[PDB]
């Protein structure tokens, strides 16, 4: 179905700190769901390491 296994095809780096990051194709506007629901995940419980 149009949940067409929508892999992250189009990333476009800007130099070793930043890319465009895009996810396609989506259900007649469904970037409105993912871009606010999943974007909260990306601010909740994430990896890396630092001073404590």
């Amino acid at each position: 179905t149009e949940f067409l296994k929508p892999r992250l095809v189009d990333i476009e780096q800007v130099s070793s700190t930043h890319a465009k990051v895009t996810l396609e194709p989506l259900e007649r506007g469904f970037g409105h769901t993912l871009g606010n629901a999943l974007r909260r995940i990306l601010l909740s419980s994430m990896p890396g390491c630092a001073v404590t």
Binding site: H32, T33, G35, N36, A37, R40
Partner: protein
């Protein structure tokens, strides 16, 4: 015979015709909103449930 009634349409018109339209003027930006206490203004974006 209020439907099959006729009326004169003045010298210059034998007949007249009409159509009526139920225009479903949906929720959209640029349209205007308010509340009872004098707050009045334009709908200025539609926001995903989490964009709020």
């Amino acid at each position: 015979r209020k439907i099959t009634q006729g009326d004169d349409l003045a010298p210059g018109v034998l007949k007249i015709v009409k159509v009526y339209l139920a225009v479903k003027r949906r929720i959209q930006p640029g349209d205007k909103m308010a509340g009872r206490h004098g707050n009045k203004g334009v709908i200025s974006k539609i926001n995903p449930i989490e964009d709020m």
